Symmetry: C3
C-alpha cells in the first residue's frame, strides 16, 4: 500500500496496474493532486462518503472490464466483490463499502473463503481464474461467466454491461453474461425476468421495428398499426401535458420522442442506479409538471406484452413484474374493460 | 422539524409535502446523503451561505408552482415571502434569507401579521387562501393574483413565470399575474414598464414577426425593411467584431443570431437574476473581446420603440427606461442627428 | 492590497483594473461571495492549491490579452511572469506559483531585476513598455513580441494564442508572436519545431485541403489519393476498434472523424495543458477501450511529413520530433519496409 504508488499508476497507466514507482502527492479540499513540473494537477475529486485517500485508491483499483450494471448486482443482493472494485458511476462511488483483497482500509478479508465473508453474498467473476471454484465453496454468492459451467443451470443476463461507466452492447468485447446464485450453500434457480435497456434520453437508440415505428410515426398511426386501442398508450407512453399535473409518461422511449421535438427538465432527486427511476419533470413548453414521475426503460415490445397479459376487470390493483431479477410493482387502473393507466410504483 | 423527515419527503415525494416518515441521513462535505440499501446516496449539495441542513430544508420547502422571477421580486423591493420559499435557481440558494412559518432556523415569525414583519415588504400569493386579506392588513407588501381583486387597480405582470427553475409562458398552467404593492400602509400605483423576455442564448425563440425577420434576414435587408437607418443597429444589436475591443452587442437576440453561426464565450461574473446582465465576452472566431458587455433581453419591437422615442440632438446623455418595474439607465451617444450607440449602464 | 477592492473591480470591471472602491465580501467553502442587495452572490470558487483569497486575487489579475498557451511556456522552461499572471484555464489555476509585482502573498519580487529572479526563467511581454529592455538585462528569460527586435534573431511561434481561456487564431487581434530566449545571460537559438494546433474534438476545424479530404472522404479513398499505402494510417490515424484493446487512434483529427459518426468517452486523467495528451478511451459502439491512448493534434500534413521522413528498416526504435519547442518521443514499429504503428510515448 502507498498513496504515492497509487498516484504513480494513475498518472502512468490511467488506473492501478500494480506498477512500481512514486509521484509527489498533495491532499486538500477532498481532492488529490500530484506535482507535475513544479505545479499541482488534480487527479481525483472525492464525491464519496469515504476518506479522500481511501476513495482515491478504490477508484484507481476499479474494474476496467465490462461488468454488470450496479442495479443488477443490487437486485441479486450482492454485498461485496471478490478481489475487485465495482465502481458505481451513477453515484461516483464504490458500489460496495467493504472489499476483499483490494485495500487495507476497507478490506474485511484478503480472500473470500475467510469466515467473515460467509453471511455476505460475494460477487465472483468467472473470467478471473479460480473464482468459479470459489463460488462453489461459497455459502452466499453471485457468479457471472461468458460460457457454460459444468453442473450449473445458467440464467441468461442482459445484453448490455458497463465498461468504464459506459453501458453498451459489446461488439469487440463480450457483455452478455450467464448468472448463477447461491443462498445458504444452495444453488438458486433465478426467476424468469425482463430486462431494462439502460438507455439515455438524448441519444435514444431503438432496438425493434416497433420502437422504430413509435419514434417515426405519429401517435394515432402507431396505436392503429399495433392495435393498442383501449390500452391507454396516449396517457401512459406518450404522456398528457394538458393539465398542470403531467399525466403518465412512464416509458423512457416516450420521453425520448418528446425531448426530440420539445425539451423538458428532469430532476434526478435520487441519483443512483435502479431498475426504475423517479424524476421531478417540468415541461418547458406547456408548464405541465409532476413531482414523482416513475420512468422505466423497457423494450416497448416487452411493455406491450406485459400490459396485454393483464386482466382488466377491476378498478385498481397491484401488478408484479420481475424486471432485472427484482419484483417491480405496477399500479393498474381500468374502467369498463379498458386501461386507464399502468405505471410502476416505487 | 426533523432533518430525517425532510429527507423522507424528498426521497418519497420529490420535495417537502408534510408527509410522516424518516430515512437515515449523513452530513459531510456541505452535502446531505441518505442510506439506500446499505449505500449512501447524495440528496443535496449546499451552494448557499447557510448551514447545509438549513439550506437543505429551505430547498425542500421551495415553491413548486409558477412564481415570479427573482429579478421581478427584487425590483419591487420584496424582502421576505409569507409561508413559502422562493428558491433562486440562478444563485442555487433562497431568494430571501429569512422566512415566515417555514423553518425554525430562519423564521423571524410564524405569521406575517407579527410586528417584526411590519417594516419588511412581504410577498403574498393570492392563489393561497387568505393571503389577499393578509396583504390588505400588511403595512408593506407585494401581491400577485390570477384575477381581479375587489377595490384594487392591477398591474399586468410579465407573460412568463418560473416553474422549478424553468422560465416559461404557461399553457397548461397560468404564469401571467396581476401585481399590487403597498408602502407604509398605502396602496401604490405601479409604473408603466417594459418587461424582459428571460430567454437564453442557445434555444432563443422569437416572439414577433420583426424578431423572425431579424433571425432569418441578413443585416442590411432587415435594417432596410424596418427603416432603421441612422439608429446604428449595426453596432448596437448586430455587434462590431472588427477591433480588439468588441463594439456594441447589447440585445440578447443579437447574441443569439451570431451564436447560431459563430460560437463565443460568455463569462457570467455576477451569477444572479437581474433585469440586465454584464458578461465578459470573447469571440472565438475573431478574438474580439470586452470585459463588461451589458446585455438585456427586450422584445426587439420594444427596443425599437424605445430608441425611436429619444431626442438625438446631444452628444451624450442618460436615458431612463422602466423595465421589470425598475429604472434602467441607458447611455445614448449621437452625432449629427444619428445614433452612435445606445446601451444599458449598470 | 485589499480583498474588498479586488472584489469591487471584479463586480464593476469584470477583472482587476486598479479601480478604487470596495464591496462587502464573505469567504466560506473555498468560495468568495459578495453581498448584492442583501443576498450573497458567488464571485469565485477556488480550484487551486493556494488559499482561497490569494487564488481569487491572482485570477482577478490574470492577463486578459492574447497570451502563449501554457504548454508553450512550460516547454520553454518559463518559471515566472514579469508583472502579470498567466492563468491556466486547463487547470483553473495560476500557471506559475510565484509572481513579480502582482500580489503581496505570492510575490518574490516587485521587479524582475531583483537578484531573487536571476536563476528563474522570467517571461517578458514585449507589448508591455520596457519589458524588451528587461529581457536584455535578464540572465534567464523568454520574450514574445509582435514585430522585430533590434539585434535579435526571432523564432516564429504558433499562429494561435489563448485569450481568456479561448485558443484562437486572431483576426481582430494579433496572436502570432516572435519568440526569444536567454540562458545564463546568453541568447539561445530556438530549434526548428512543429506546432500542435490546439483544437478540440467537438468543433474540429480543418486547416488544409488534406484535412478537408480526410474528414469528407472515406478511409481507402483518402489513403489512395495521398499515396499513404504502407504507412498504416488505418491503424494510427483512423483507429482499430475490432479487438477489446483499441488500436492506434493517435491523431486528434482521427478522433474528430469518428466522434462525428460514433460518440465515445475520453477520460482526461491528467487535466493539464501539454503538447500531447493521454486519455482513457472507451468506444461506446464497439466496447473497444484502452487505458493510455496518446493523442496529439498535429496538422495532418505535418504528421505525413514526419512519418514519410523516417527510415523503416528496423523492428522498433524511438523517433524524436521537436514539437512546441520540446522533444517528443515517438515509437516507430515497422515490418518488411512497412509501418506497423507510429505513436507518441509520454
Ligand atoms: C382521478 O382519480 C379517480 C380515480 N383514479 C385514480 C387514478 N386513476 C387512473 C388515472 C388514469 N389516467 C389519469 C389519471 N388517473 C383513476 C381513475 C390513478 O392513477 C391514481 C394514482 C395515484 C393515486 C390515486 C389515483 C386515483 O385515485
Ligand atoms: C470613442 O470615444 C469618443 C467619444 N465617444 C464615446 C462613446 N462614443 C459612442 C461610440 C459608438 N460606437 C462605438 C464606440 N463609441 C463616442 C463617440 C462611447 O460609447 C463611450 C462609452 C463609454 C465610455 C466612453 C465613451 C466615449 O467616450
Ligand atoms: C504485438 O506485439 C508484437 C510486437 N509489436 C509490438 C508493437 N507492435 C506494433 C503494433 C502495430 N499495430 C498494432 C499493434 N502493435 C508490434 C508488431 C507495439 O506497438 C507495442 C507497443 C507497446 C508495447 C509493446 C509493443 C509490441 O510488442
Amino acid at each position: 500500500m502507498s498513496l504515492e504508488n497509487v498516484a504513480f499508476n494513475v498518472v502512468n497507466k490511467g488506473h492501478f496496474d500494480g506498477q512500481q514507482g512514486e509521484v509527489p502527492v498533495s491532499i486538500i479540499n477532498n481532492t488529490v493532486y500530484t506535482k507535475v513540473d513544479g505545479v499541482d494537477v488534480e487527479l481525483f475529486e472525492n464525491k464519496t462518503t469515504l476518506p479522500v485517500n481511501v476513495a482515491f485508491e478504490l477508484w484507481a483499483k476499479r474494474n476496467i472490464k465490462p461488468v454488470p450494471e450496479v442495479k443488477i448486482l443490487n437486485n441479486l443482493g450482492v454485498d461485496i466483490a471478490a478481489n475487485t472494485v465495482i465502481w458505481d458511476y451513477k453515484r461516483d462511488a464504490p458500489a460496495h463499502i467493504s472489499t476483499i483483497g483490494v485495500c487495507s482500509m476497507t478490506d474485511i478479508a484478503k480472500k473470500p473463503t475467510e469466515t467473515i465473508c460467509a453471511p455476505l453474498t460475494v460477487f465472483f467473476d468467472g473470467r478471473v481464474d479460480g473464482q468459479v471454484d470459489l463460488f462453489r465453496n461459497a455459502r452466499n454468492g453471485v457468479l457471472i461467466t461468458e460460457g457454460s459451467v459444468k453442473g450449473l443451470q445458467p440464467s441468461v443476463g442482459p445484453k448490455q454491461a458497463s465498461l468504464n461507466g459506459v453501458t453498451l452492447i459489446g461488439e469487440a468485447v463480450k457483455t452478455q453474461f450467464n448468472y448463477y446464485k447461491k443462498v445458504d450453500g444452495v444453488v438458486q434457480q433465478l426467476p424468469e425476468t425482463y430486462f431494462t435497456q439502460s438507455r439515455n434520453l438524448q441519444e435514444f437508440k431503438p432496438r425493434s421495428q416497433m420502437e422504430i415505428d413509435f419514434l417515426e410515426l405519429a401517435m394515432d398511426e402507431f396505436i392503429e398499426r399495433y392495435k393498442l386501442e383501449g390500452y391507454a398508450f396516449e396517457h401512459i407512453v406518450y404522456g398528457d401535458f394538458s393539465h398542470s399535473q403531467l399525466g403518465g409518461l412512464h416509458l423512457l422511449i416516450g420521453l425520448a420522442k418528446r425531448f426530440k421535438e420539445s425539451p423538458f427538465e428532469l430532476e434526478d432527486f435520487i441519483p443512483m442506479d435502479s431498475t426504475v427511476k423517479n424524476y421531478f419533470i417540468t415541461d418547458a413548453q406547456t408548464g405541465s409538471s409532476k413531482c414523482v414521475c416513475s420512468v422505466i426503460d423497457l423494450l416497448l415490445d416487452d411493455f406491450v406484452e406485459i400490459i396485454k397479459s393483464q386482466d382488466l376487470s377491476v378498478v385498481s390493483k397491484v401488478v408484479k413484474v420481475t424486471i432485472d431479477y427484482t419484483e417491480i410493482s405496477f399500479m393498474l387502473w381500468c374502467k369498463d374493460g379498458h386501461v386507464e393507466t399502468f405505471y410502476p410504483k416505487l
